[PDB]
Design a protein around this ligand. Structure first.
Ligand SMILES: [Ca+2]
Ligand SMILES: [Ca+2]
Ligand SMILES: [Ca+2]
Ligand SMILES: [Ca+2]
Ligand SMILES: [Ca+2]
Ligand SMILES: [Ca+2]
Ligand SMILES: [Cl-]
Lengths: 329, 328, 330, 329, 80, 329
RNA sequence: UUUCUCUUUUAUCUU
RNA sequence: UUUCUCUUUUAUCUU
RNA sequence: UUUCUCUUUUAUCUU
RNA sequence: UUUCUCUUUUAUCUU
């Protein structure tokens, strides 16, 4: 049954829903209509992380290139406020691709498009000290713009990047996974568009709201700060929903874990880049894989405990064969 | 092959005439199948047209706002001296707040499936006079880049509507008929696919505050008013319908106007909207090609009487096109 | 053949305007065989220009998907590439103004949005065998039109956002995937949609230079500058979804390099009801699965560029790649 | 496959797109509905020609009977102006058919209709001295009329022959062939009507605008002067587009060549003419040939280099068999 | 046999009623296949007819001119 | 016969002596004892170049990572003098690997080792204007050090990088290839050590002699200037002899060409680099390939004309089979 | 671009 | 205008 | 790490 | 200029 899929079409589905803990081929690309030259980037992060007691730590798997996630900590039982600021954590070699200045992101590559975005939280802590829960839901966060006037001389109108849908982080979504901390968790996001459009690399973005822009004007409920332009930054915004994770650590609880992040991204490389050497045409269209991708995604749970992560690939193959069969009637 | 339930519903909300208890359907049978909330916006507006005036109505793919209306002296078109004002769909505020920075509080993005409009004359036959003329415009929301002599010197970039110049003349492809005969017309996706558009914050006027209409290139103005009552939350990929009601001097032109919109929004987990969301309908190749074929085959607009047999006209175009394909 | 019979009439025309020389193809073709079937106006822009290259200078040309401008050129010192000090200047296709007016704010008067189908270019040397010298190198860059965000110390202090050309840097190095041959052998090369689908792009208002007026090249990241000149003669009306063809013509000193330059552009526009253009419109041709798949395949199968001599073999060369892949399916 | 064509139907297609350098049968006529008596005239010119340096020489293959082409020279980088005058070059024996006075053209024949109109430019010059290019495009030039008043006594209204579509010569058509001079060129024109209508022979035409007629009144962008009525003249205007050729010779360039012109024309002969002796009925209708003619014509390039001229006939047969085959489905 | 795309479009521009987003079609499906430009001319004219007058309108095959209008006293026809 | 070589062992020999004009696999690595993780970098340059008349232009294919070659021009009939300075030309994406400051070269990679170094010069110029010759020889240039005292306070002793064997560029080596310019040339260099040792990446090197160092102290006959630290630099010195090319262009000669450069390099990647994603173990030892490598190298000519470049691979296979056969006795 | 064998040599899919 | 053979004798189409 | 088939799917070597 | 078939397609010579 899984023989109706082209080689890449299958590979594609594995990067998408499978956890390549093994050094599996990073990617073969996306089996969609596009077949121009791209570079399959397999971003993976392994961050050991300790959650502070009495704090409800928030993590955002936000489809920003090179930066695995963003996290902020808030007093237990509460959510981010205007007073909150999220700080990015990068994937290995951020600078090796986007440079060290807010105006050199498009040096290596010009555009991109995500294929997968997975995350897992495995628990370090012993069974006597842990406590608390891990809650997950996904937000349709897009990167729009805000228009407002400014009393300068002459008076003028401003336009800047603003994040819409952030207000979704201020409450636990109805469609969510919630369970004991110790059980860990695995979850992934998918393309929030009817197709895989290429997005441009964005220059100069270090903070949202921008420098000199008040938060109130933006609409955004809180702030995104990538920090020094030489260490991190916002190079773009993919068409993937953002995964939200709330790890609430009660008082005196010793909750530690290891967090892993996966990201299959097709970048359009520049000839002057060395990166270009590893370019290859995108895999040619695989109608079946593209239809299964959608079906599988819609079928899977918001998230699952860490243990069920291994059977994840197996869980996926059954949904496919079950879909390919129920469609042979 | 045949259409799915959602794929058929999709075609009904799309071309279905008003009255049919049309089902919003599960939404768009297009490759996307993520979480969405289907809203079927409907407006019923009693309205009287100023005699000796040529009133211009615009159905444009802005969420929450049915149409935009401006009026000018009979025989003329909008001028730089003209400003169009929104009329809201019921509950605009309950969706996009009361601040120009509250639009994306409930939903983050959207995509139009249909955008219909109908005008049913209520005038008694002698009293009424005039015509109704319709044509559609490919109005897109772009941007304009101009420098500004501030200190230090800077360059501005702001929203600007392109293709508005098409409203200053009656498009060759148009429907023209006696006012009394009413009218029904619909718009459709002006893109090959139904991609999602983002919700836009801060937009109240175009040209925006502190920008001269000269800077934008726009032929006239768009004013939504108090940010507490209305505003421009986004611009969808649908051609904009233009309606000219020509009321001569001493003409009593009264009528009802209905606005239909089928929109798929991406709900924010925090919104009270979310509990009504489901997943966008899985791809229905048939529907997606029927949609396109029907759209192209349908007239710009029709009189109100032909609207009733409109659905039947659609099933007619469905079988004829489907029959040729089945034969091979 | 069975392949040729499967293709819808517009679908065939589409492929020709895309991969084949204009002289071979009288037709533009109706338009793009994709799902979109709304009202459009197919224009096939063709520039013919006798050009002579500056001896002792490398001239760089860019076939960049901006409507109604054929290409952008600039010459630099032999052996070097564009620098911050360099500025590229457009050459228009015939009747630029008749399409996009004469002021930087009247670009969207005739049409509102657009989408490219094909974008070819060819150089036919006209020098005798006692005067020609030098090389013609060609590669393509994925140049997209994005934006840059940066704060400004005005009163009050504000944050700017302007247009920036991303991936322009690729023009400063000849990528491993390239065509390079003696000048005399001329060259032919086309570009194709760098997106999975042909979506429409808006017409851009007020753009005359990039970086724009009052902006330092430094704050944009762009390696060099783009200047369309007087708003009354040219300008940047938009940026299509096609990779940009880069061309480096090196002329040694004392060399007479003359040639003819041709440029094709199959573009589908969204006509404004008021435009005098509109009366020539028609509906975009309906979807042709086959043609769209052949397009992709052929596109990826063709070489970066080819010498002018085997350019005629091109149409026939393509007809081969179509029947070779349409062989695997059945 | 090429056996579905009648003998003449094939012949017809050869005269049309083939270069009978060989003394091939001149013609068998046109396989259209008409079958009355005609005379198949195979006009052929062999003119050695040297292009002056710094001049962009313009040649017009204009479907005027007996006159191969018309040429004028303009300063390089420029086009004909109101100040330009084109002078005809005749095909052998012009006078032997149209006489020696502007009012004796219809003496031999009364009407006509073109079948083919081909032209080729082969290059004399060595590879060290040549330079420049040959550009080609075709213009829909028809022969209409202009109506204007004249202040005579009594005042009256004039009506005279005027050429419409000449403005097409003032710019290089978008559909054109352009290439290095040395590569030569071959191109042909075809019937610009849905059928082969007969045109009358025109008496008294020596210049356009006529004698006593100002150029401005005509609309014509430049002038056509056939010269002495005893040596040349305009005897008619066929339903063929006119082939335009711009040979631009840079400064110091030594560009010479040999130009050849072909023209298959069916003339209606007069009994009192000796010419009549060689009359024969037009070939009876050959639906296939008439449909192929159209297909082939539409398929062929504007023009091709001289070298590809030999394979021209072969190029044509493949288009036919390819059309006859793709139509057997 | 059945009609071609252009041949069908041809029949639509020919008899198609106004409103149908009629496609100019590629033009005339007639033996000729040379270069042409298809133009679909459309005029929308608001007009009032003089009372006691018999207004005469002429649609005539002149490019660029929709119609020709003259008016005469009711019950009569054009005169020199 | 060529089946006694492992897959990589063969590949290895192709990168070494074959011109992958085709996008052949860049590399599989070096079949030597080492099997740790490396990244096979296939550096390739395509530089159009015009040689000035009356000048004897000198090009050095010097096994410095990221920089294809270095060239200087001297008055015809002469060689570099103390007054000469060579300027590097980079391979695409220099900065994308070694950064933009003289102290960030070891950011991406830590060490390296060359496998191949090939160069070819193909001629643009016509046969009437060219003149002159291309001369080639190879120099055993190593990167050593110089020790000298400096009268500072307190007085101290300096030690800096100095290039030994540069004096080999001041005369045409006895073992050389010399031939008419128009004939072009192809030549390659090989490992100048009994094994493939890894060399470290060198920080801070922009010029040799260094800044503040007089040329006389160094011993070096001329100067090496990589220019702005943000555009180029000397990141290391491989164990390959340097290829020297002297293109002497007489007065009035119009000599142009296209120069190509190949370089197979195994770099030891850093985990924090994205570059690392494309790492793989070095191919395991292939005694045969390593012995053939040596034999082939020793056999081949200094250089050959451009035309014989295509048969180069074939020329190589025959030497191998001829060696594998003459060794079966 | 015309053609197969052979070993390759990876890479999945299945027991 | 009623009919074939025969050589003609050109003329293409195909290997 | 225990085992084969199968199609893969690239990749060379040979005619 | 190297070679035949095939239909041609005219054109005579003969019943
Ligand atoms: Ca908000
Ligand atoms: Ca899209
Ligand atoms: Ca405008
Ligand atoms: Ca940059
Ligand atoms: Ca005129
Ligand atoms: Ca020394
Ligand atoms: Cl020109």
């Amino acid at each position: 049954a899984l023989t109706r899929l082209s080689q890449p079409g299958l590979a594609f589905l594995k990067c998408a829903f499978a956890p390549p803990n093994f050094n599996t081929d990073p990617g073969k690309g996306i089996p969609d209509r596009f077949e121009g030259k791209v570079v399959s980037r397999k971003d993976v992060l392994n961050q050991s992380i300790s959650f502070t007691a009495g704090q409800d730590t928030f993590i955002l798997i936000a489809p920003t290139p090179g930066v695995a996630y963003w996290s902020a900590s808030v007093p237990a039982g509460t959510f981010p406020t205007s007073a909150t600021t999220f700080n990015p954590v990068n994937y290995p070699g951020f600078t090796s691709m986007f440079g060290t200045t807010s105006t050199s992101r498009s040096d290596q590559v010009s555009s991109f498009r995500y294929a997968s975005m997975n995350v897992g939280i495995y628990p370090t802590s012993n069974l006597m000290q842990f406590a608390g829960s891990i809650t997950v839901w996904k937000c349709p966060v897009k990167l729009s713009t805000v228009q407002f006037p400014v009393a300068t001389d002459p008076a003028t109108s401003s336009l800047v990047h603003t994040l819409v849908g952030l207000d979704g982080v201020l409450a636990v979504g109805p469609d969510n996974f919630s369970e004991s901390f110790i059980k860990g968790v695995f979850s992934q996001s998918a393309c929030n568009e009817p197709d895989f459009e290429f997005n441009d690399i964005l220059e100069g973005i270090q903070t949202l709201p921008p420098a000199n822009v008040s938060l109130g004007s933006t609409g955004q409920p809180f702030t995104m700060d990538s920090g020094a332009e030489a260490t991190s930054g916002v190079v773009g915004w993919g068409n993937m929903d953002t995964i939200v994770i709330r790890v609430s650590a009660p008082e005196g609880a010793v909750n530690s874990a290891i967090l892993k992040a996966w990201s299959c991204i097709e970048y359009r490389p520049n000839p002057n880049a060395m990166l270009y050497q590893f370019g290859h045409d995108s895999p040619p269209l695989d109608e079946v894989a593209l239809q299964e991708y959608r079906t599988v995604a819609r079928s899977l749970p918001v998230a699952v405990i860490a243990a069920q992560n291994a059977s994840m690939w197996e869980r996926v193959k059954s949904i496919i064969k079950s879909s390919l069969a129920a469609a042979s009637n």
